[model samples]
Target: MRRGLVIVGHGSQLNHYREVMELHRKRIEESGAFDEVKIAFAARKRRPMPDEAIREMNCDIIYVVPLFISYGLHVTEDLPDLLGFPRGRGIKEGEFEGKKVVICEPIGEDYFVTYAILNSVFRIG
Candidate 1:
């Protein structure tokens, strides 16, 4: 009835991709400050592809976070077009199927992701 979160990721035929989505779903549902949280794929082939996932939610407002590493083809072109986001990729807002949709820039653009990338170095000191 209030707000929810949609964790969006690229889907693959592999199990690991699905596993990662599960990780977010589990962890967030535990620590969730939102009314609820769910996962969606930009893959466009599955049951819960972004749009369908949104339709399933009862939240009046939903936050869509693209779980991507870079603002590449999918983040820049495919998802925006698929989601009908005119502002495209960056933090923007729109209405979808009578609910308010708040879209975010894919995670790679965030400072937290960059910081995490820095920690991946073996011996950066």
Candidate 2:
């Protein structure tokens, strides 16, 4: 049961945007938490599609962490569409034969995430 982390983001069409996204992905991989780590995009801007990233990694189990700022269309629809999952699926652990995919809650759901945004706004006030 080797587990992996697949960080999914709405990748930018710009070169710089993709670079930054890849940097974060690389940092997470370097953290050495999972057996494998892959960075994928819901919308293809510069690199491979989301499924390609998953296939390329060849991970047994994948933890899908969406980098979307909110639980809007991308989180609710587009991402899963790209990954071959149902739209509006709740966070749960499941499998695709030899591969398992665990969809996680969008990062913005936490109170700390709200606080961080509020903090930034306060600083500018």
Candidate 3:
């Protein structure tokens, strides 16, 4: 089975944060990078638990990309602890009761991202 992209964020009670996350998800989906793309929150906010998001969306594979800037506790501990997969294993390329799940790394610390930021800031008009 194939997987889909799930953008994980630290959901806030504020509306703007939720809106921003949704916007990015929309943009990713519009870009057609993956077969499917959805957003999930680690804390606070509402709707769509991670596992449920995968199941309800009928996604055979799940790629969890944390929308955080640092590999903090959430990236190292919280996310794995919070995720209630069928088994206790984290980030596996196997079937969860016949469903495939693949947890990805946090979306930060990429060299290309640094290059992109530098280009944007220094580009001449």
Candidate 4:
């Protein structure tokens, strides 16, 4: 029952985001931030949908970081349905399916992301 982190993203049919998540998976696992790190998808086209991300991990507590830019249907609506929180819930720490689950806010809310967006306007090389 160690700690686990699941990064859920809007996967697509083409599959670029999955690889990006994979890169994160490797890095997180290597860093030992949690006992393990997993990648799940909000989109059905991908494997390990939200709930399955929990099903596969044997952790005392699980933290889910949604890989989305902002709050919308995916955050307030779809994610709750997929992750099994009451309608319009699961954005905070609470018990779920007999385990402690903490769903972090969408990454877009972080201030540094604006820096990332601004930086994207230029090319380093």
Model 4 misplaced stretches (Cα beyond 4 Å): 87-90, 118-125
lDDT by residue (1-125, candidate 1, tens digit) is: 68889988874677789788888788888886788888888755775888888889999999998888868777777776777877444687899878999888887767877777887884366
lDDT of each: 0.81, 0.74, 0.69, 0.80
List the candidates' TM-scores in order.
0.84, 0.76, 0.74, 0.83
Deviation of model 1 at 13, angstroms: 3.3
When summed lDDT is taken over every stretch of 10 residues in candidate 4, the lowest stretch is 82-91
> What C-alpha root-mean-square deviation, in Å, does candidate 2 show against the real structure?
3.6
Taking all chains together, the TM-score of candidate 3 against the true structure is: 0.74
Shift in Å, residue 20, candidate 2: 2.8
Residue 86 CA displacement from its true place in model 3, Å: 12
Best by lDDT: 1
The reply for model 2, stretches above 4 Å from the true place, is 115-125
Task: List the pairs of residues colliding in candidate 1.
Answer: none
Give candidate 1 regions above 4 Å deviation.
118-125
Clash count for each candidate, listed in order shown: 0, 0, 1, 0
Q: What 10-residue stretch in candidate 1 is worst by lDDT?
A: 80-89
lDDT of 2 at 78: 79
Q: TM-score of the candidate numbered 1?
A: 0.84
Candidate 3, residue 38: Cα displacement in angstroms equals 0.6
